[PDB]
Amino acid sequence: TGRQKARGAATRARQKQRASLETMDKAVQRFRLQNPDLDSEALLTLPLLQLVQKLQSGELSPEAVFFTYLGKAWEVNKGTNCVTSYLTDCETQLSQAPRQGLLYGVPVSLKECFSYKGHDSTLGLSLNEGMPSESDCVVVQVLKLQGAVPFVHTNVPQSMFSYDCSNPLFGQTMNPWKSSKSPGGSSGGEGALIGSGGSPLGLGTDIGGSIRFPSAFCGICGLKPTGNRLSKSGLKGCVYGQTAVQLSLGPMARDVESLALCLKALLCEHLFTLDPTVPPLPFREEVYRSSRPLRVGYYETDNYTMPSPAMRRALIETKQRLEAAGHTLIPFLPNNIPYALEVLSTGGLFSDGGRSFLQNFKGDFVDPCLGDLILILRLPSWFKRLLSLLLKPLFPRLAAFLNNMRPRSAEKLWKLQHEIEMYRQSVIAQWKAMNLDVLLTPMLGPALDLNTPGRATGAVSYTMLYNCLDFPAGVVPVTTVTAEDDAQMELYKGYFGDIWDIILKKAMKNSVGLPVAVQCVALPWQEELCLRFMREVEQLMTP
Amino acid sequence: GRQKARGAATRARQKQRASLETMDKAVQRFRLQNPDLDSEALLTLPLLQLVQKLQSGELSPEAVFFTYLGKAWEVNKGTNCVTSYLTDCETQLSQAPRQGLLYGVPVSLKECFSYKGHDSTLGLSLNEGMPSESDCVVVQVLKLQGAVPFVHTNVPQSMFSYDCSNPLFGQTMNPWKSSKSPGGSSGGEGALIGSGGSPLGLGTDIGGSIRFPSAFCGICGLKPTGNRLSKSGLKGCVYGQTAVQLSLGPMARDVESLALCLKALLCEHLFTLDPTVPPLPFREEVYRSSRPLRVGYYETDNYTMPSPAMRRALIETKQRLEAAGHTLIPFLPNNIPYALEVLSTGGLFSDGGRSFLQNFKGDFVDPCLGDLILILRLPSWFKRLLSLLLKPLFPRLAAFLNNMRPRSAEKLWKLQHEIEMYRQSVIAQWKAMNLDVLLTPMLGPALDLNTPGRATGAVSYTMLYNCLDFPAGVVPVTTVTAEDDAQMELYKGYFGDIWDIILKKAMKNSVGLPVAVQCVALPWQEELCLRFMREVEQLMTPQKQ
Numbered sequence A: 001t002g003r004q005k006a007r008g009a010a011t012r013a014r015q016k017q018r019a020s021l022e023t024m025d026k027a028v029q030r031f032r033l034q035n036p037d038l039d040s041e042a043l044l045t046l047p048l049l050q051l052v053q054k055l056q057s058g059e060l061s062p063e064a065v066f067f068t069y070l071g072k073a074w075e076v077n078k079g080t081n082c083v084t085s086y087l088t089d090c091e092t093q094l095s096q097a098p099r100q101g102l103l104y105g106v107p108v109s110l111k112e113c114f115s116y117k118g119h120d121s122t123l124g125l126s127l128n129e130g131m132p133s134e135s136d137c138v139v140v141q142v143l144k145l146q147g148a149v150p151f152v153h154t155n156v157p158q159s160m161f162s163y164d165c166s167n168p169l170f171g172q173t174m175n176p177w178k179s180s181k182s183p184g185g186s187s188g189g190e191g192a193l194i195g196s197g198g199s200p201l202g203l204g205t206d207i208g209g210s211i212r213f214p215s216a217f218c219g220i221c222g223l224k225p226t227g228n229r230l231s232k233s234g235l236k237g238c239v240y241g242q243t244a245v246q247l248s249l250g251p252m253a254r255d256v257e258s259l260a261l262c263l264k265a266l267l268c269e270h271l272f273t274l275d276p277t278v279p280p281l282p283f284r285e286e287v288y289r290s291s292r293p294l295r296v297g298y299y300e301t302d303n304y305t306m307p308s309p310a311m312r313r314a315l316i317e318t319k320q321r322l323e324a325a326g327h328t329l330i331p332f333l334p335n336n337i338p339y340a341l342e343v344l345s346t347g348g349l350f351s352d353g354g355r356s357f358l359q360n361f362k363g364d365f366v367d368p369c370l371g372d373l374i375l376i377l378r379l380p381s382w383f384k385r386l387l388s389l390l391l392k393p394l395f396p397r398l399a400a401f402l403n404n405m406r407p408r409s410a411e412k413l414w415k416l417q418h419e420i421e422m423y424r425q426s427v428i429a430q431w432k433a434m435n436l437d438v439l440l441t442p443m444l445g446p447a448l449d450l451n452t453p454g455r456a457t458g459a460v461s462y463t464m465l466y467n468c469l470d471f472p473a474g475v476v477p478v479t480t481v482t483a484e485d486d487a488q489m490e491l492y493k494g495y496f497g498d499i500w501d502i503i504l505k506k507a508m509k510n511s512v513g514l515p516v517a518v519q520c521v522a523l524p525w526q527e528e529l530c531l532r533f534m535r536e537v538e539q540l541m542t543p
Numbered sequence B: 001g002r003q004k005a006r007g008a009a010t011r012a013r014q015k016q017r018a019s020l021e022t023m024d025k026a027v028q029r030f031r032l033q034n035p036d037l038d039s040e041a042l043l044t045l046p047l048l049q050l051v052q053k054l055q056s057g058e059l060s061p062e063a064v065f066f067t068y069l070g071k072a073w074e075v076n077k078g079t080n081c082v083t084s085y086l087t088d089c090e091t092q093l094s095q096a097p098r099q100g101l102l103y104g105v106p107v108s109l110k111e112c113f114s115y116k117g118h119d120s121t122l123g124l125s126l127n128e129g130m131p132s133e134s135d136c137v138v139v140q141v142l143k144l145q146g147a148v149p150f151v152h153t154n155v156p157q158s159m160f161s162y163d164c165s166n167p168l169f170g171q172t173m174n175p176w177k178s179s180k181s182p183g184g185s186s187g188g189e190g191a192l193i194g195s196g197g198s199p200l201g202l203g204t205d206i207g208g209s210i211r212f213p214s215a216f217c218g219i220c221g222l223k224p225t226g227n228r229l230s231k232s233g234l235k236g237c238v239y240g241q242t243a244v245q246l247s248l249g250p251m252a253r254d255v256e257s258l259a260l261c262l263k264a265l266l267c268e269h270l271f272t273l274d275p276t277v278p279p280l281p282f283r284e285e286v287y288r289s290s291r292p293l294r295v296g297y298y299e300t301d302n303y304t305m306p307s308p309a310m311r312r313a314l315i316e317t318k319q320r321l322e323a324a325g326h327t328l329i330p331f332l333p334n335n336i337p338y339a340l341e342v343l344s345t346g347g348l349f350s351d352g353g354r355s356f357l358q359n360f361k362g363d364f365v366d367p368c369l370g371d372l373i374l375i376l377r378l379p380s381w382f383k384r385l386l387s388l389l390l391k392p393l394f395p396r397l398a399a400f401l402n403n404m405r406p407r408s409a410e411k412l413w414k415l416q417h418e419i420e421m422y423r424q425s426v427i428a429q430w431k432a433m434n435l436d437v438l439l440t441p442m443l444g445p446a447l448d449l450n451t452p453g454r455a456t457g458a459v460s461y462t463m464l465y466n467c468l469d470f471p472a473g474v475v476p477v478t479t480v481t482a483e484d485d486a487q488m489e490l491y492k493g494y495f496g497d498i499w500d501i502i503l504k505k506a507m508k509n510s511v512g513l514p515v516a517v518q519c520v521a522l523p524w525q526e527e528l529c530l531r532f533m534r535e536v537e538q539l540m541t542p543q544k545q
């Protein structure tokens, strides 16, 4: 009732998913029959750069690499539900992959929003079902021109506006380390698939952490570039024309060198000609390969989200190993974080009170992983305001987010956009006054229980700050939760004692052994330097 | 009710008078010490050769500086283009970094380029007596490149105009003809450079403000992609408007000068001073290419009827390019009326003009602004009523009026997305024809004083490229003949509304004035845009190279 259309969409989506997996399995079995000899485990454990080298040299055939990864992806999907669709014609793309491409023969996984000709990009939304893309988005075209073979679409939380990973069409994606845990999101299918060995390279998008959450939660590396470093042309989205806080797309992979190779392959004449709106900045190898001592700003906490004990240890140990390696570590925290999060980020993301975003959910189910976000956004402006006034004395954080999610005039949007611009210049000035090269920060972890990110909005603080600032930011795994880390979490209080702090403690319970990351940041357009820094952390923390 | 604005104007005029007297003193002192200096020779050297002689030591920075200062003072007498002498610039002179790419080059600045210790009034009382406390980023970079910024030049009040008068410093006049506008809003730059009083200047452009004064005054100007150069520290009058991006860029006597200025600005100094600007070095090889181009072109945008001189300029340039072996392909960006009336107008005035109007509270409104302020002040419901009445007879006026109404953030998002889609749509057309560059008419010849504010429609040629955010430059290619001028009597405009009527009259009596064409390339392709401009300059006015 009011859900007949949504129910029919889910029924067809599930049958498409099921038929996709069956097709993959058929293809894999056929291949294995003809190739009983192939050492599949050796092939799967090769770091991407080595895989690429052997594909370029002919030591490994693209078919062997393709079907071996296809088989692994099908297998790890069993326990994770990360795959929504097999990009069918990728078998033919395989046979015609450009031979001198930088990614020749490399199977690549795609977050579902990367439009692929002939396939839906549903984003888990009933209204996007049965609407196959007319063509590949630009970054998909460039991947193919560089010889890569995009082979699957991976799951996202409904609408993508979430750091969990469930929707009413394909269901819930689970963390491959612990099935009761979220894989993070919104690029959570990617995180789960790459984190379990089913893909050597993937693409995600990030507006509040959506590349970094799943990378950290699933123990892999991820980079969110400056928003306009790579082309978003052709991507499927759910809000259009919101430019205060820009969406960014970037790579996810098992190591830092893979992220660098992916960026190098994307930043080519092909991309710059297909999307003239992206500045034609080539990948600067000399910056990325540099090995000079860095001035590293760092903070153990943002005073907003109290770090978990494992987060704090991860940060301090990384700081200490960097110092031992000759880098200079400088205490540094961007000024006015609560304003950046509550006023600028929230205000920019929801300038219209959520009406545009809400159009997506009309007649649809609302996935439990979204929590009360939809119900809150639907509230009348006067009531959001009233409710905010009431909450303010007891729970200022909740009050602040709520008041800043109201609709406003174009006049007020200009003012907010100007404040965003000035805040960016403020942090840049602060940075330059300490002469920083890069910035090391905590990263949210370990993974939260399924269906809890929707109830812990405050915890986007570590990531969304750099969307607001539009600085490149990436994450690197550096440790795993210990018994002691996990025991200490039982004393966690947070700085506010509101529902978000309380949920986080419970949602992080039972995490021994899960991966924990740190975040590496550089200035706008300095992706190469940001990756150089990530590489240094990777060398020191996972030797 | 105006004592405030009257006091402001009195102080501003005194400050300008004192600046000019300071210049006169400095110039005379220098001349007495250098009676043998061949100033005409020095003033007529193309900037490239001027730069070379400064770099080798053949000319001293003092000789170049004081000779240009003198010329600037002299041409100011008939144009009123200089508002302020940037006083500490003589000390910058003696400290200019010796290896800088602009070592010893005097540079003029549009008044909005913040310079420590000086107002950037924009012709507005509310900004008078509030001196900047830091050089803006592009000014810091010029200085780091050894250039010597030396004057602030006049703008129309608020800058939101293609004429050039304000109540503080008064009206700037075209150096070719004192009854004509020098264009704007970078009009002081146009008049100063166009009359030989500066070898290089910086302007800004949101609807044509670099390109109009370049064209009206017969010089070269380039409006890059909006974020190619740093706007950090500029003085503005509307903040946070990002649908139609402001751009800053160089103005000069020849194309090579624009290229040199861009090359000097696009350096590590700028990219470290403003990390928000993508660090794209000037690609010398693209600028210097001699390969044949595929050149899209149009002789009319079907929105503003071109003057007979504009049309002739365009067709002659087209034919010389064809003769030089380039491929000329007819091309017109789709949906121009929609891009101007809905996207550009709605983008510039999304809030009904409220933020803009705050600047005028308690101020005189310069006559060159026409009825703009009066119209913007009208109640949204009345703009809507008047639009409906006007629609049947005067669709164009009705449309502008309807799209200057205030709206929600929700509607602004929708508009921003339509802008993004429109950009991609024109890009797709361009790609489908495999264009390298695009040749278009440029508004000219110069309009009579006080008429640009009453001919808003004529921004069509230039504003389209702020909407699209493509680099666009102008190059002088001919002058109005008596034949071209007599033909204005047959000019009707496509609409016959007040804007066409004003334009017809405003473009008459222009014999001998310069006429330009406009050169366009894709976003971030300034070097290719400049390569095409250099080709046009060479073919139409070979003696400039």
Ligand SMILES: *[C@](=O)([C][C][C][C][C][C]C1=[C][C]=[C][C]=[C]1)C1=N[C]=C(C2=[C][C]=[C]C(C([O])=O)=N2)O1
Binding pocket: A159, A160, A161, A162, A163, A185, A186, A187, A205, A206, A207, A208, A209, A210, A211, A236, A237, A238, A239, A240, A247, A345, A346, A349, A401, A457, A460, A464
């Ligand atoms: C992720 O970056 C989203 C991660 C969760 C952010 C939640 C922030 C929040 C702030 C204030 C109140 C509640 C929550 C990601 N990937 C894609 C997107 C996204 C979001 C909106 C629109 C689009 C789009 O149109 O493509 N993408 O977020």
Ligand SMILES: *[C@](=O)([C][C][C][C][C][C]C1=[C][C]=[C][C]=[C]1)C1=N[C]=C(C2=[C][C]=[C]C(C([O])=O)=N2)O1
Binding pocket: B158, B159, B160, B161, B162, B184, B185, B186, B204, B205, B206, B207, B208, B209, B210, B235, B236, B237, B238, B239, B246, B345, B348, B456, B459, B463
């Ligand atoms: C010039 O580009 C202005 C050229 C005239 C454009 C008139 C377009 C128009 C008028 C009326 C109705 C519809 C369209 C220029 N230089 C600077 C600026 C400018 C304008 C506004 C704000 C700012 C700023 O804040 O720096 N600059 O316009």
Ligand SMILES: [Cl-]
Binding pocket: A228, A279, B227, B278
């Ligand atoms: Cl940009």
Ligand code: NA
Binding pocket: B370, B371, B453, B454, B455, B456
């Ligand atoms: Na008018």
